[PDB]
Amino acid sequence: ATNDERCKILEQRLEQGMVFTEYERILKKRLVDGECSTARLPENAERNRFQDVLPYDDVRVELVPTKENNTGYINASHIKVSVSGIEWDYIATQGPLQNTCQDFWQMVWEQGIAIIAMVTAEEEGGREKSFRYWPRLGNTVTYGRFKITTRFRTDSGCYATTGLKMKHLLTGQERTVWHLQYTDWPEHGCPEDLKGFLSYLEEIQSVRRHTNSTPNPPLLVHSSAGVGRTGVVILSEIMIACLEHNEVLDIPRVLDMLRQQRMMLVQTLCQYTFVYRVLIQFLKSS
């Protein structure tokens, strides 16, 4: 029940408004070896949603080079953290563009991805935040050598689960990909329903566990920019796992480690304070 001491500390820090000082001291990106030269190539300009939100060279997801994409470039970062003995493996990526759908599915295939955690809407405020890279039911699409079929979509209130089949058109191999989309989460803000977000995290945790039981692949997390709401998901799941290991909690240490793998994770104070609220409620129900 040492979680009780953690929950008081967290509630007090939030209640007294000491969260901000902690958050604003965390650097947004690497100080050194922060080169994003491949991402900055003129040839890759159309592949970035924002020319300043970029993967670092040494952790970018490298696609096998193709005719259409010689550098095999996608705006996506490997995120590998070890926190309290747990080795976490994610890929964090931006929302696909019309012209990066083949790249996105090539990454899904090559990296062995079984679960997509989508935490953006397709459209918000009249703007595209993610291209519709998977088919709409009523049910198949082809991007280069990958055929994607939507089997079903089931709504769980705050999020929806879509069963996808992905087929390699040159080998005939097929794989199931589970698409878990949180549907009401404004960009730069927080989920509307805190408990709904916890149930979304619970479903990601469950499906990862059970698909692993049947080299485990990274979880693919994406938003629009691939840093804000993506960062909330990753930092929340890591910190929740920390709650069982007695070791002293150090959220800004963890977020700093994460931003060493992909810049700008967790864009706003409300997103960071939301992670505190998530942990408090998780501990309040333990």
Numbering used by the authors: 878 to 1015, 1019 to 1094, 1100 to 1171
Sentences copied from the publication:
PTPN21 belongs to the four-point-one, ezrin, radixin, moesin (FERM) domain–containing protein tyrosine phosphatases (PTP) and plays important roles in cytoskeleton-associated cellular processes like cell adhesion, motility, and cargo transport. Because of the presence of a WPE loop instead of a WPD loop in the phosphatase domain, it is often considered to lack phosphatase activity. Combined with biochemical analysis, we have found that PTPN21 PTP is weakly active and is autoinhibited by association with its FERM domain.
To further investigate the working mechanism of the phosphatase domain of PTPN21, we determined structures of PTPPTPN21 C1108S in complex with a phosphate ion as well as PTPPTPN21 C1108S in complex with a Src pY530 peptide. The phosphate group is 3.3 Å from the hydroxyl group of S1108, and the oxygen atoms of the phosphate group hydrogen bond to main chain amides in the P loop. The scissile oxygen forms two hydrogen bonds with two water molecules, one of which is the “catalytic water” (WA1). The water molecules themselves are coordinated by Q1152 and Q1156 in the Q loop as well as E1067 in the WPE loop. The carboxyl group of E1067 is close to the scissile oxygen with a distance of 2.7 Å. Compared to the PTPPTP1B-pY complex, water molecule 2 (WA2) occupies the position of the tyrosine moiety, and Q1152 is in a downward conformation due to the absence of tyrosine. It is likely that WA2 and E1067 as well as WA1 serve to stabilize the phosphocysteine intermediate after P─O bond breakage, and what we captured in Fig. 3B is a product-complex conformation. The invariant R1114 residue is held in place by electrostatic interactions with the inorganic phosphate and E1001. In addition, R1114 forms a hydrogen bond with the backbone carbonyl group of W1065, which helps to maintain the WPD loop in the closed conformation. Close examination of the electron density revealed that C1155-C1070 in the open structure formed a disulfide bond, while C1155 and C1070 in the WPE closed structure are free with a distance around 3.9 Å.
